[PDB]
Every structure is written in structure tokens, then in C-alpha cells.
From Swiss-Prot, chain A:
Assembly: Interacts with spike glycoprotein E1. Processing of the precursor of protein E3/E2 into E2 and E3 results in a heterodimer of the spike glycoproteins E2 and E1. Spike at virion surface are constituted of a trimer of E2-E1 heterodimers. Interacts with 6K protein. Interacts with host MXRA8; this interaction mediates virus entry. The interaction involves 2 adjacent E2-E1 heterodimers.
Places the protein is found: Virion membrane; Host cell membrane
Post-translational modification: Palmitoylated via thioester bonds. These palmitoylations may induce disruption of the C-terminus transmembrane. This would result in the reorientation of E2 C-terminus from lumenal to cytoplasmic side. N-glycosylated.
Role, per record: Plays a role in viral attachment to target host cell, by binding to the cell receptor MXRA8. Synthesized as a p62 precursor which is processed by furin at the cell membrane just before virion budding, giving rise to E2-E1 heterodimer. The p62-E1 heterodimer is stable, whereas E2-E1 is unstable and dissociate at low pH. p62 is processed at the last step, presumably to avoid E1 fusion activation before its final export to cell surface.
Protein name as catalogued: Spike glycoprotein E2
Full protein: residues contained: 592 to 644 of 1248
Length: 53, 53, 48, 53, 53
């Protein structure tokens, strides 16, 4: 049995998404583009952080 | 490190010490320290307490 | 929801309280009795 | 004074890890833990009663 | 982690474990591990050992 993370807070803008993360222990975050070029990215998060995509 | 020992029949103790490196692997995309109440299930393997041939 | 000022009041002895945290209830697991939930953590602690 | 405890009784509850990696019903269980003091003391609530016969 | 336990009246033990994160805060402009003999005094808060209503 493995645990699950809590929900983030999300705000919207023109052609971008902003997210605020609340981790309790190290967690992995990744995202990809749909279509022909995925452009894979990956990072580890250990504390409160804000990202924009 | 790893150490084992026991007590003799004349109230004397014995020990022996060997070097070792212990680090359990990670299952899933999160690192956790104990067993939660709310979560998901994934496959893994164990030892069975049986004395059969 | 997660910065300075999630909870506010006018004086330490007042009874009126304003709150803007997130609170969502979740489905209980099979065979147990409990009340799980999801909530944003406190913002006053982070500022310190 | 202890007069407030005259008519009360203890109870049993669910615990997520009973020592072997499995859940069980235990006569001792945990409630909220508070860590508000700045010098680093803790206050813990359990299901049994101490000091009363 | 945090663990509690006690001994039954038939010589049987019981335990229960919950996850936790413990890190006392920092007071002043230096980090120290014990209480010194020669130093300075600063404010803080604590719990009082009183059973009053």
C-alpha cells in the first residue's frame, strides 16, 4: 500500500497555467506535449514551490 | 553495520560484527516512511513463513 | 488559501471569524470507519 | 480533581500499523498531536485512562 | 515516526505507529544542541504542569 498527495491550487491566464504545490515528502512532477513532439520534462520537489507552464 | 549476539549458560555475552550496506528500494513515484490509511495498492514480493520442504 | 491572511478577525476577543481554506471530503476505504478529507495547510506557520 | 471521570469508560479503535506491517484493532490508539509551543514540547491524546482504578 | 505502547495483565505487549514530522524551531541567530552555562536570555513559550480547570 502506497500514499496519495493532496490537491494543488490552480489559476488561469492567457496560454498559461499557474500552480502552487504543497508537498509533505519528496514527490515527482512531469508533463508532456500532445502531438508529434512530446518535449518531456521531469523534476523532483521537496518544498513549497510555484511553477508556470 | 550488522551485529548479532546471545547469552551463555554462565552469564557471559558474545557478539560478532560485520560490515554491510542496507537501503530498501522505492515503490511508486513517492518516498514515504510508514503505512497510511488512505491510498492505493501496487505489486511487490515477500518471504513466506513456511517450514515445508 | 495558502498565504498570509487565510484567517482574519477584528480583535482577540471577537466571535466573528472569516476563513478561506479549501475543504473537500473523500470516499472512505473498504472495511473501515473513518472520515478522510483534503485541506490546504496553514499559512501563518509558513510565514514564521 | 478527578471527579469528572466518575461515569466514563475506555474504548477500542483502529490502528494502521500494529508492529508487523499489518492493521489490527488495539486497546491503545492515537488522536491529534499538537506542537504549538516554541520550546518543543508535545501533547498527545490516547484512548486509555491513566491514574484511575 | 511516533510510537506508543504498554504491557497487558497477561504479559502481552501492544504498539501502534503513526507518521509525523518533528523539527523544533530556531530561537536567535545561532543554532545550538544543548543548554549552555554562560549566555543570554530571550523570550519563549511553554506548557504548564497544572491540573486546574
Amino acid at each position: 500500500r502506497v500514499p496519495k498527495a493532496r490537491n494543488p491550487t490552480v489559476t488561469y491566464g492567457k496560454n498559461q497555467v499557474t500552480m502552487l504545490l504543497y508537498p509533505d515528502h519528496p514527490t515527482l512532477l512531469s508533463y508532456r506535449n500532445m502531438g508529434q513532439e512530446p518535449n518531456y520534462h521531469e523534476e523532483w520537489v521537496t518544498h513549497k514551490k510555484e511553477v508556470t507552464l | 553495520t550488522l551485529t548479532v549476539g546471545f547469552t551463555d549458560s554462565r552469564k557471559i555475552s558474545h557478539t560478532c560484527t560485520h560490515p554491510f550496506h542496507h537501503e530498501p528500494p522505492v515503490i511508486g513515484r513517492e518516498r514515504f516512511h510508514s503505512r497510511p490509511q488512505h491510498g492505493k495498492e501496487l505489486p511487490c514480493s515477500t518471504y513466506v513463513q513456511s517450514t515445508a520442504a | 488559501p495558502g498565504q498570509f491572511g487565510d484567517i482574519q478577525s477584528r480583535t482577540p476577543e471577537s466571535k466573528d471569524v472569516y476563513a478561506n481554506t479549501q475543504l473537500v471530503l473523500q470516499r472512505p476505504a473498504a472495511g473501515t470507519v473513518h472520515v478522510p478529507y483534503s485541506q490546504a495547510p496553514s499559512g501563518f506557520k509558513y510565514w514564521l | 480533581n478527578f471527579n469528572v471521570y466518575k461515569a466514563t469508560r475506555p474504548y477500542l479503535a483502529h490502528c494502521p500499523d500494529c508492529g508487523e506491517g499489518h492493521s489490527c484493532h488495539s486497546p491503545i490508539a492515537l488522536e491529534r498531536i499538537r506542537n504549538e509551543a516554541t520550546d518543543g514540547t508535545l501533547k498527545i491524546q490516547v484512548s486509555l485512562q491513566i491514574g484511575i482504578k
